[PDB]
Design a protein around this ligand. Structure first.
Ligand SMILES: Cc1cc2nc3c(=O)[nH]c(=O)nc-3n(C[C@H](O)[C@H](O)[C@H](O)COP(=O)(O)OP(=O)(O)OC[C@H]3O[C@@H](n4cnc5c(N)ncnc54)[C@H](O)[C@@H]3O)c2cc1C
Ligand SMILES: [Cl-]
Ligand SMILES: [Cl-]
Ligand SMILES: [Cl-]
Ligand SMILES: [Cl-]
Ligand SMILES: [Cl-]
Ligand SMILES: [Cl-]
Ligand SMILES: [Cl-]
Length: 372
């Protein structure tokens, strides 16, 4: 079998890995350089969580994603995951809290709800309002994202994959014996095509009318004056639903400081129009929010970063076959929370491309729930 994978962000790289491991001939095509920072996959760390507030239907998928991250780590010898536990902060009726409890109960997962007093005792680095609660889980942690991105490409190449960078795909069409893919430089042919185009999905897949909106979001890295009180042993990954917005962060790590980002809002843009400049007022806002809930974390700003999310209307992913051409499958619309699922999305895409179907429980992420 031959497959072409369009886009070598995390999802395309995972898909090239899952196909090559099956003995499938795979050629990946990516418009920019390897492990570039213009899409959604870049950075040294991402959060993985198991008691999943967005919907309990993700729990069996993230559980398989954990198993596949472990297999990837074993085969490549790269260190990919650090389980730290995770804490979610919010009012008792915040979706972060409600949804994680629902997911955990439904899947039998260990978790602990703490009131503000108990949370301050357990995690004194957090400064919470008296009416907030914390929900703690054990299996959450840090994916070393760039290590994972490189791992997939190394192990795919070990299994025969070819990966091409600096090649922009203009389109594709069935040719009677598979698909022909048109690039800015020539044509390539395969039995099947997988599209994992990230924020560029409505360009390449324009004629499908996917309901996707690209958002610019910001991350800051700060240096505490007392780093040791921010280290993983005392500060798990965290997420917070607060009056200033939804935010997330990581414990202090060497050469990263404390990383803090904002999940909600963020400007609607396209990858062409996105503002890469991060303004002084943007920096001051982020450090102002971080200092309210984690006082002493931002003695110095180390770095600021822009990145892109691709949102669906319901914030659930889209993975499905092309509605006209069964030789083509695609995943898009990861809505700011897909990186942790990349290993299992590569599995699912390889199943949809080779077999037309998957035993993974990805039905709820198809086109159907979005139909009129
Ligand atoms: C700041 C930030 C923090 C995040 N935090 C988390 C987190 O903690 N945990 C989590 O699970 N998720 C997180 N995410 C979300 C996650 O990183 C994304 O969902 C995931 O990266 C999407 O991967 P992708 O491969 O779809 O997209 P992308 O990485 O953007 O890849 C698409 C690739 O397709 C290429 N391309 C597009 N069109 C063409 C074409 N015509 N021809 C050739 N190449 C093409 C692009 O150049 C790009 O390399 C975060 C995202 C951001 C921005
Ligand atoms: Cl670990
Ligand atoms: Cl913990
Ligand atoms: Cl050819
Ligand atoms: Cl301090
Ligand atoms: Cl910077
Ligand atoms: Cl995204
Ligand atoms: Cl189809």
């Amino acid at each position: 079998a031959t497959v072409i994978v369009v886009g070598l962000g995390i999802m395309g790289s995972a898909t090239a890995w899952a196909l090559a491991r099956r003995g499938v001939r795979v050629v990946g095509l990516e418009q920019y350089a390897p492990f570039h920072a213009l899409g959604s996959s870049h950075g040294k760390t991402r959060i993985i969580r198991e008691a999943y507030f967005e919907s309990p239907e993700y729990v069996p998928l993230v559980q398989r994603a954990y198993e596949l991250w472990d297999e990837l780590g074993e085969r490549t010898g790269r260190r990919l995951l650090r389980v730290t536990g995770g804490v979610s902060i919010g009012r008792l009726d915040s979706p972060f809290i409600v949804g994680a409890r629902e997911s955990a109960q439904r899947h039998g997962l260990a978790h602990e709800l703490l009131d503000a007093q108990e949370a301050r005792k357990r995690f004194p680095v957090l400064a919470l309002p008296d009416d907030f609660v914390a929900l703690v889980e054990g299996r959450a942690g840090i994916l070393f994202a760039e290590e994972c991105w490189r791992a997939f490409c190394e192990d795919a190449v070990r299994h025969g994959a070819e990966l091409r960078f600096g090649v922009r795909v203009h389109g594709f069409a069935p040719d009677g014996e598979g698909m022909t893919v048109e690039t800015e430089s020539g044509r390539l042919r395969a039995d099947r095509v997988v599209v994992t185009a990230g924020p560029w999905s409505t360009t390449l897949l324009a004629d499908l009318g996917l309901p996707l909106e690209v958002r610019r979001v910001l991350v800051v890295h700060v240096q505490p004056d007392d780093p040791t009180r921010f280290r993983p042993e005392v500060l798990p990954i965290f997420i917070m639903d607060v009056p200033e917005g939804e935010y997330y962060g990581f414990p202090f790590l060497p050469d990263q400081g404390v990383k803090f980002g904002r999940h909600d809002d963020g400007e609607v843009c396209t990858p062409e129009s996105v503002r890469r400049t991060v303004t002084d007022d943007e920096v001051r806002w982020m450090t102002g929010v971080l200092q309210r809930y984690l006082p002493g974390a931002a003695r110095e700003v180390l770095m600021t970063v822009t990145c892109l999310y691709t949102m669906t209307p319901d914030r659930h992913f889209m993975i499905d076959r092309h509605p006209e051409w069964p030789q083509v499958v695609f995943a898009a619309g990861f809505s700011g929370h897909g990186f942790k699922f990349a290993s299992v999305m590569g599995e699912a895409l390889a199943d949809l491309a080779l077999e037309g179907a998957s035993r993974l429980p990805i039905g709820f992420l198809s086109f159907r729930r979005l139909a009129k």
